[PDB]
């Protein structure tokens, strides 16, 4: 019988494997598994005797064989696996007696199976649900012995009747047939913990009509519920689950949530699938409560307890979700919250501070020009620190949590040469905060900031036309600047008033009651994605034309447009650049504004009839 030695190893591995919570897992000393007396199973010429012997005589060894012991003319040919548990009856025995014997013997067979379940499955190798259930089913065996003794005293007086005996054993037969069904099912391969907790709901429904097997199955389930519910306390009311094994609810890793904690989906009972993410998210949240110091306890904490029809015990999980998720949130709405944190990120990355970067460009021109690999980050951090201080940008407290970082790619992530291609900022992460405001997500956020900085940087380039011509008679350069500025400022008003603030407020208002951290993460994703989409270029055609537009303009606005080669302070090579830039620009301008037509700003770019055809 190697099965009792192989399944044993699998089921304790299935408790040592995922978790080492609780040290040095025990195993029972070997001698328990191998004596025949720790199993509920084990001289006259009988056929010549009159019936006044026979009936009374056979109930003797039957009454022995009702218990796990040998008979005297009834017998048991040996077990070798063989879970039907056959019984041997003698020749020269009356066949009218024999059929009633065969009516009774299935008691002895199912009994031997029950008690073989007892010796084996009560061990450390099979999980706390099997421990408390094995206690429950070792209960009734003594009542069977009591019955046996109550029959034995009648037998000793010799008053006993086969028909009375048969009549009496009926609730016993029924009762241990109930157990044998659960036991033999758990004996089908395995039932670890929650996989059993199919049966412990489902078998009570399967017996709901019988009205004796029903309350029996309530008892068996009332026993088995307690240890599983007793560890359940430690993720519903506490920061870490004290599973002494690995047999309930959560896989977990040592390192985001998809790593930290994941449901063990058949180690959830017949009842709790719709509660499983409630529990798992709550446990995750309580881990944060603990992670942060905080307070790891619970005022709704009381025993989770089984009931079949009036199944209102599952609302304890809802009451706990509305305590424990909620108390984590009540932290995350006055510290590690979205509020002053997102005000700083809005101030710099979404450039709500429009008085910050005037300093940065008034300072960093020594950076904004030098060839490749000359990157100097302490100088950049000092430029940030000064451009902060001299401005009003100075005033917010998270400016010191802020940093200068570097980006390698000039928007070509879509599918030194300092600053213009390479700026980045970072409001630094904390691991408690990394469940919401986090670097891996702030990558997408830095792409929006690159665009908002770059577009206003080429606005500084275009604005250099104004200061570099205002001899003083020519206006073709300034109406060319007008044709560009009528676009680039009025994309920027859109990119700044419409792309962010509506979308941002769409998230912001939710923060007052947003159900849970994954909901907040969904809002944050949708917000950042919607803005991302509310930006001009973020299309599969990519509106790549805009880069060319801004390119030919930067050659105009800074690289040629310098006091008309100081003439005011006439060989037509000045005007030939305006003509060639106009020839590129006017056509690329047409395609871009046409695309802005076929894909609300365009309506105000036409308005009174501002060209309409370029």
Q: Which residues bind another protein (CB under 8 A)?
A: 146, 149-150, 153
CA distance 436 to 429: 10
Angle at alpha carbon of residue 562, lines to 556 and 563, rounded to 5° = 130
CB contact set of 207 (below 8 Å; sequence gap of 6+): 178, 213, 214, 216, 217
Are 137 and 143 in contact by the 8 Å Cβ rule? The answer is no
Q: Which is nearer to another protein, 5 or 305 (CB)?
A: 305
Residue 149 or residue 586: which is nearer to another protein going by CB?
Answer: 149
Residue 326: both structure tokens together: 């909620």
* Cβ burial, residue 222 (10 Å; 0-12/13-18/19+): middle
- Measured CA to CA, the distance from residue 585 to residue 403 in angstroms comes to 38
Instruction: Please give the Cα distance from 553 to 463 (Å, whole number).
Output: 11
Please, which residue, 141 or 458, has the CB nearer to another protein?
141
Residues forming a β-bridge with 88: 75
**Distance in Å, CB of 64 to another protein, minimum:** 17
Q: Between 83 and 150, whose beta carbon lies closer to another protein?
A: 150
410 within 8 A of 424, measured Cβ to Cβ:
no
The least distance separating another protein from the CB of residue 400, rounded to whole angstroms, comes to 42
Shortest distance, CB of residue 165 to another protein, whole angstroms? 17
Q: Which is nearer to another protein, 232 or 442 (CB)?
A: 232
Closest listed residue to residue 350, CA positions, set 461, 501, 485: 501
CA separation (Å) from 411 to 9, 480, 484, 510, 538? 57, 27, 22, 32, 11
Least distance between another protein and beta carbon 235 (Å): 24
Report in angstroms how near the CB of residue 153 gets to another protein at its nearest: 7
Nearer to another protein, 154 or 375 (CB): 154
Select 312 or 415, whichever has its Cβ closest to another protein.
312
Which lies closer to another protein via its Cβ, residue 35 or residue 309?
Answer: 309
Burial class (CB in 10 A: 0-12, 13-18, 19+), 388: buried
Angle (CA) 287-289-292 rounded to 5° is 105
Report the alpha-carbon distance of residue 350 to residue 369 in Å, rounded.
Answer: 24
Q: What is the Cα Rg of the chain in Å?
A: 41
- The least distance separating another protein from the CB of residue 149, rounded to whole angstroms, comes to 5
- Asked whether the beta carbons of 349 and 398 are under 8 A apart, the reply is no
Q: How far is the CB of 146 from another protein (least distance, A)?
A: 6
DSSP string over 417-469: -TTTTTEEE-----TTTTTTS-HHHHHHHHHHHHHHHHHHHHHHHHHHHHHHH
Of the two residues 17 and 149, which places its CB atom closer to another protein in the complex? 149
User: Are 552 and 584 a contacting pair, CB within 8 Å?
Assistant: yes
d(CA 528, CA 272): 35
CB of 157 vs another protein, minimal distance in Å: 12
Residue number, 139 or 149, with CB nearest to another protein: 149
* Dist CA 549 CA 582 (whole Å): 10
Instruction: Give me the residues paired with residue 89 across strands.
Output: 74
Nearer to another protein, 306 or 321 (CB): 306
Q: Of the two residues 37 and 312, which places its CB atom closer to another protein in the complex? A: 312
Q: How far is the CB of 144 from another protein (least distance, A)?
A: 13
Rounded CA separation 63/151 (Å): 8
From the CB of 389, what's the least distance to another protein, in Å? 51
Q: How far apart are the first and last CA of the chain?
A: 92
Least distance from another protein to the Cβ atom of residue 303, Å: 9
Taking the complex as a whole, how short is the minimal distance between the CB of residue 196 and another protein, in angstroms? Answer: 24
| Closest separation in Å from C-beta 137 to another protein | 20
Nearer to another protein, 175 or 353 (CB): 175
Reference 137, options 202, 225, 222, 220; nearest CA is 220
């Amino acid at each position: 019988l190697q099965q009792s030695l192989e399944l044993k190893r699998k089921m304790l591995r299935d408790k040592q494997n995922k978790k080492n919570s609780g040290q040095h897992l025990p195993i029972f000393p070997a001698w328990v598994y191998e004596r025949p007396a720790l199993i509920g199973d084990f001289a006259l010429p009988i056929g010549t005797l009159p019936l006044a012997s026979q009936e009374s005589a056979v109930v003797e060894d039957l009454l022995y064989v009702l218990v796990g012991v040998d008979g005297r003319y009834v017998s048991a040919q040996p077990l070798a696996g063989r879970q039907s548990r056959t019984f041997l009856v003698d020749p020269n025995l009356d066949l009218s007696i024999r059929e009633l014997v065969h009516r009774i013997l299935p008691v002895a067979a199912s009994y031997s199976a029950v008690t073989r379940f007892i010796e084996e499955k009560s061990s450390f190798e099979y999980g706390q649900v099997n421990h408390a259930l094995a206690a429950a089913m070792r209960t009734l065996v003594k009542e069977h012995l009591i019955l046996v003794s109550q029959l034995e005293q009648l037998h000793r007086q010799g008053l006993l009747s086969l028909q009375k005996l048969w009549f009496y054993i009926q609730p016993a037969m029924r009762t241990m047939d109930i157990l044998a069904s659960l036991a033999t099912s758990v004996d089908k391969g395995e039932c670890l913990g929650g996989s059993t907790l199919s049966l412990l709901h489902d078998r009570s429904f399967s017996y709901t009509g019988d009205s004796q097997a029903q309350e029996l199955c309530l008892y068996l389930t009332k026993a088995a519920s307690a240890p599983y519910f007793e560890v359940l306390e430690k993720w519903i009311y506490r920061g870490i689950i004290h599973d002494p094994y690995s047999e309930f609810m959560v896989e977990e890793h040592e390192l985001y949530w998809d790593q930290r904690y994941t449901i063990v989906q058949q180690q959830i009972p017949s009842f709790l699938q719709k509660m499983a993410d409630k529990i798992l998210s709550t446990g995750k949240y309580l881990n944060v409560v603990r992670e942060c110091g905080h307070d790891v306890t619970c005022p709704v904490a009381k025993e989770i307890i089984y009931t079949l029809k009036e199944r209102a015990y599952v609302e304890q999980i809802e009451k706990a979700f509305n305590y424990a998720s909620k108390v984590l949130l009540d932290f995350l709405m006055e510290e590690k919250e979205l509020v002053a944190h997102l005000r700083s990120i809005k101030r710099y990355f979404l450039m709500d501070q429009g008085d910050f970067f005037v300093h940065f460009m008034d300072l960093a021109e020594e950076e904004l020009r030098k060839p490749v690999e000359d990157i100097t980050p302490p100088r950049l951090e000092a430029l940030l620190e000064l451009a902060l201080r001299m401005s009003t940008a100075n005033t917010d407290p998270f400016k010191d949590d802020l940093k200068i970082d570097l980006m390698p790619h000039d928007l070509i992530t879509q599918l030194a040469l300092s600053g213009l291609e390479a700026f980045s900022f970072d409001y630094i992460v904390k691991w408690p905060l990394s469940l919401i405001i986090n670097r891996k997500a702030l990558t997408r956020y830095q792409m929006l900031f690159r665009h908002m900085f770059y577009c206003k940087h080429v606005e500084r380039q275009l604005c250099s036309v104004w200061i570099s011509n205002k001899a003083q008679w020519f206006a073709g350069a300034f109406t060319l600047r007008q044709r560009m500025l009528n676009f680039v400022q009025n994309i920027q008003y859109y990119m700044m008033f419409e792309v962010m603030e509506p979308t941002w407020h769409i998230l912001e208002k939710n923060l007052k009651s947003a159900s849970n951290i994954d909901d907040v993460l969904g809002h944050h994703t949708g917000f950042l994605d919607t803005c991302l989409k509310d930006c001009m270029l973020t299309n599969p055609e990519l509106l790549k034309v805009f880069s060319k537009l801004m390119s030919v303009c930067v050659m105009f606005t800074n690289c040629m447009q310098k006091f008309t080669q100081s003439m005011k302070l006439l060989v037509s090579g000045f005007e030939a650049t305006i003509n060639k830039f106009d020839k590129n620009f006017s056509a690329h301008l047409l395609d871009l504004l046409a695309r802005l037509s076929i894909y609300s700003v365009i309506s105000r770019l036409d308005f009174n009839g501002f060209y309409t055809e370029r």
